[PDB]
Design a protein around this motif. Structure first.
Motif, mmCIF file in Angstrom:
data_model
loop_
_atom_site.group_PDB
_atom_site.id
_atom_site.type_symbol
_atom_site.label_atom_id
_atom_site.label_comp_id
_atom_site.label_asym_id
_atom_site.label_seq_id
_atom_site.Cartn_x
_atom_site.Cartn_y
_atom_site.Cartn_z
ATOM 1 N N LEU A 56 0.818 -1.215 0.000
ATOM 2 C CA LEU A 56 0.000 0.000 0.000
ATOM 3 C C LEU A 56 0.850 1.263 0.000
ATOM 4 C CD1 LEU A 56 -2.448 -1.721 0.101
ATOM 5 C CD2 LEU A 56 -2.946 -0.945 2.381
ATOM 6 N N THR A 57 0.446 2.240 -0.795
ATOM 7 C CA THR A 57 1.173 3.508 -0.869
ATOM 8 C C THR A 57 1.270 4.239 0.479
ATOM 9 O OG1 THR A 57 0.372 3.723 -3.123
ATOM 10 C CG2 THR A 57 1.191 5.749 -2.055
ATOM 11 N N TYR A 58 2.442 4.801 0.784
ATOM 12 C CA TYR A 58 2.561 5.713 1.937
ATOM 13 C C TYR A 58 2.007 7.101 1.543
ATOM 14 C CZ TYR A 58 4.969 9.003 5.129
ATOM 15 O OH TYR A 58 5.268 10.032 6.009
ATOM 16 N N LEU A 59 1.133 7.692 2.356
ATOM 17 C CA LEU A 59 0.600 9.046 2.019
ATOM 18 C C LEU A 59 1.630 10.085 2.437
ATOM 19 C CD1 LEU A 59 -1.640 11.078 1.116
ATOM 20 C CD2 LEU A 59 -2.635 10.847 3.451
ATOM 21 N N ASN A 60 2.142 10.814 1.429
ATOM 22 C CA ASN A 60 3.230 11.745 1.690
ATOM 23 C C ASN A 60 2.788 13.166 1.400
ATOM 24 O OD1 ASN A 60 5.499 13.417 1.485
ATOM 25 N ND2 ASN A 60 6.890 11.765 0.865
ATOM 26 N N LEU A 61 2.480 13.934 2.454
ATOM 27 C CA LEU A 61 2.058 15.325 2.319
ATOM 28 C C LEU A 61 3.169 16.317 2.780
ATOM 29 C CD1 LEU A 61 -1.760 15.104 3.488
ATOM 30 C CD2 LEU A 61 -0.730 14.945 1.098
ATOM 31 N N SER A 62 4.396 15.810 2.933
ATOM 32 C CA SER A 62 5.449 16.637 3.570
ATOM 33 C C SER A 62 5.697 17.946 2.801
ATOM 34 C CB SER A 62 6.731 15.803 3.752
ATOM 35 O OG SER A 62 6.429 14.825 4.758
ATOM 36 N N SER A 63 5.757 17.847 1.467
ATOM 37 C CA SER A 63 6.051 19.038 0.612
ATOM 38 C C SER A 63 4.892 20.033 0.707
ATOM 39 C CB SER A 63 6.281 18.637 -0.842
ATOM 40 O OG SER A 63 7.392 17.716 -0.942
ATOM 41 N N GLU A 64 3.660 19.496 0.698
ATOM 42 C CA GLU A 64 2.495 20.389 0.760
ATOM 43 C C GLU A 64 2.410 21.087 2.108
ATOM 44 O OE1 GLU A 64 2.452 17.214 -0.320
ATOM 45 O OE2 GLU A 64 2.051 17.569 -2.459
ATOM 46 N N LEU A 65 2.657 20.371 3.201
ATOM 47 C CA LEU A 65 2.604 20.991 4.550
ATOM 48 C C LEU A 65 3.650 22.071 4.612
ATOM 49 C CD1 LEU A 65 2.229 17.730 6.661
ATOM 50 C CD2 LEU A 65 0.451 19.508 6.170
ATOM 51 N N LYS A 66 4.857 21.769 4.115
ATOM 52 C CA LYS A 66 5.925 22.784 4.166
ATOM 53 C C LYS A 66 5.534 24.061 3.392
ATOM 54 C CE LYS A 66 9.406 21.678 6.841
ATOM 55 N NZ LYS A 66 10.405 22.823 7.024
ATOM 56 N N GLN A 67 4.979 23.867 2.202
ATOM 57 C CA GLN A 67 4.517 24.972 1.355
ATOM 58 C C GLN A 67 3.437 25.798 2.090
ATOM 59 O OE1 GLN A 67 3.571 22.394 -1.917
ATOM 60 N NE2 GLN A 67 5.703 22.342 -2.632
ATOM 61 N N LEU A 68 2.512 25.113 2.788
ATOM 62 C CA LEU A 68 1.426 25.824 3.477
ATOM 63 C C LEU A 68 1.978 26.589 4.671
ATOM 64 C CD1 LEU A 68 -1.425 23.220 3.297
ATOM 65 C CD2 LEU A 68 -1.240 25.340 1.851
ATOM 66 N N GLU A 69 2.936 25.985 5.393
ATOM 67 C CA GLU A 69 3.602 26.723 6.494
ATOM 68 C C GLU A 69 4.303 27.963 5.931
ATOM 69 O OE1 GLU A 69 6.063 23.447 7.770
ATOM 70 O OE2 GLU A 69 4.849 23.050 9.548
ATOM 71 N N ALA A 70 4.875 27.845 4.729
ATOM 72 C CA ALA A 70 5.581 28.984 4.086
ATOM 73 C C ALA A 70 4.592 30.113 3.756
ATOM 74 C CB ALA A 70 6.286 28.559 2.843
ATOM 75 N N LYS A 71 3.436 29.742 3.201
ATOM 76 C CA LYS A 71 2.364 30.695 2.895
ATOM 77 C C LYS A 71 1.769 31.365 4.138
ATOM 78 C CE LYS A 71 2.947 30.308 -1.451
ATOM 79 N NZ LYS A 71 4.367 30.539 -1.152
ATOM 80 N N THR A 72 1.557 30.613 5.203
ATOM 81 C CA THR A 72 1.097 31.165 6.459
ATOM 82 C C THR A 72 2.034 32.261 6.977
ATOM 83 O OG1 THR A 72 -0.075 29.129 7.163
ATOM 84 C CG2 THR A 72 0.580 30.686 8.897
ATOM 85 N N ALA A 73 3.303 31.918 7.055
ATOM 86 C CA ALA A 73 4.321 32.896 7.499
ATOM 87 C C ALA A 73 4.394 34.119 6.588
ATOM 88 C CB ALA A 73 5.663 32.195 7.502
ATOM 89 N N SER A 74 4.347 33.919 5.290
ATOM 90 C CA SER A 74 4.436 35.073 4.370
ATOM 91 C C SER A 74 3.221 35.972 4.477
ATOM 92 C CB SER A 74 4.686 34.650 2.937
ATOM 93 O OG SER A 74 3.686 33.759 2.490
ATOM 94 N N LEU A 75 2.030 35.370 4.633
ATOM 95 C CA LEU A 75 0.801 36.124 4.862
ATOM 96 C C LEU A 75 0.930 36.950 6.141
ATOM 97 C CD1 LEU A 75 -1.983 33.542 3.828
ATOM 98 C CD2 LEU A 75 -1.598 35.877 2.712
ATOM 99 N N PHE A 76 1.398 36.320 7.235
ATOM 100 C CA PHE A 76 1.647 37.117 8.471
ATOM 101 C C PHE A 76 2.643 38.272 8.251
ATOM 102 C CE2 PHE A 76 0.067 33.393 11.115
ATOM 103 C CZ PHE A 76 -1.096 34.062 11.557
ATOM 104 N N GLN A 77 3.677 38.036 7.468
ATOM 105 C CA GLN A 77 4.659 39.090 7.181
ATOM 106 C C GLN A 77 3.981 40.255 6.423
ATOM 107 O OE1 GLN A 77 7.642 39.532 8.696
ATOM 108 N NE2 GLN A 77 7.333 41.497 7.634
ATOM 109 N N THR A 78 3.110 39.899 5.481
ATOM 110 C CA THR A 78 2.324 40.890 4.747
ATOM 111 C C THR A 78 1.487 41.743 5.692
ATOM 112 O OG1 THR A 78 2.351 39.619 2.719
ATOM 113 C CG2 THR A 78 0.609 41.234 2.930
ATOM 114 N N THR A 79 0.906 41.158 6.751
ATOM 115 C CA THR A 79 0.099 41.940 7.699
ATOM 116 C C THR A 79 0.957 42.971 8.443
ATOM 117 O OG1 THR A 79 0.174 40.433 9.671
ATOM 118 C CG2 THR A 79 -1.564 40.096 8.030
ATOM 119 N N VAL A 80 2.200 42.597 8.770
ATOM 120 C CA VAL A 80 3.148 43.568 9.406
ATOM 121 C C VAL A 80 3.480 44.709 8.440
ATOM 122 C CG1 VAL A 80 5.439 43.981 10.387
ATOM 123 C CG2 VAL A 80 4.186 41.792 10.768
ATOM 124 N N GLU A 81 3.853 44.352 7.216
ATOM 125 C CA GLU A 81 4.139 45.343 6.149
ATOM 126 C C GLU A 81 2.941 46.249 5.892
ATOM 127 O OE1 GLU A 81 3.961 44.017 1.965
ATOM 128 O OE2 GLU A 81 5.291 45.660 1.321
#
Ligand code: NA
Ligand code: NA
Ligand code: NA
Lengths: 88, 88, 89
Positions: free
Chosen positions: B51-76
């Protein structure tokens, strides 16, 4: 100067809309991966149970894809308006 | 009119904050999904082996990156709204 | 004139906020559907093995997303009101 700060503010907002579109795109990729594995496992469990639902996210995936596109469209629209504000 | 422009950017910055927070929650949801789905795939493997291993590691990392950048935008953007508000 | 394009810009942003709230609502549905199927499979698994696992709990996340859907929509109403104020000044 008030108007330069206004233009810069709209530009920061457009950046945020672009990051949101990108985030929804990533979410769609993750949901489609989960669907595939979950249905692989449901199939296997069935086959194993007999030797001894399924998950359909297609509607939600299509709606999210539509939202990715429409958000990206708004960034182009908003950029053109920001350009007009810069023109004045 | 400045006051209402300021208030309108403040309203938008609040939406950007809420979106960053919402993406954070989706990231937590997707991580919990992965962990469970992979626990079940492992249990099914074992049980078939007796059975395939479900691998979301790249997507989670990308979403954490977007969360942080969105927060940075709120400061700016907060900085920029403060600038418009300080218009003298 | 500057003011008209400022009004148009805020209206374009308000559209994006609305689409964002709709998108979050759709994600909430997808996550609820995943939870339902995954726990049905874990239940079936537990029953099979015992005749012969951890519950996936997204309750807090689902509630948080539903709260965000609501607040983002409330923001669109507020921002429309402020756009109405600029428009009238
Ligand atoms: Na569906
Ligand atoms: Na991945
Ligand atoms: Na939970």
């Amino acid at each position: 100067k008030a108007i330069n700060n206004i233009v810069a503010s709209f530009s920061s907002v457009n950046d945020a809309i672009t990051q949101t579109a990108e985030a929804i795109h990533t979410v769609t990729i993750a949901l489609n991966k989960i669907q595939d594995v979950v249905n692989q496992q449901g199939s296997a469990l069935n086959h194993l149970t007999s030797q001894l639902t399924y998950l359909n996210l297609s509607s939600e995936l299509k709606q999210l894809e539509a939202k990715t596109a429409s958000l990206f469209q708004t960034t182009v629209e908003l950029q053109g308006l920001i350009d007009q504000i810069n023109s004045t």
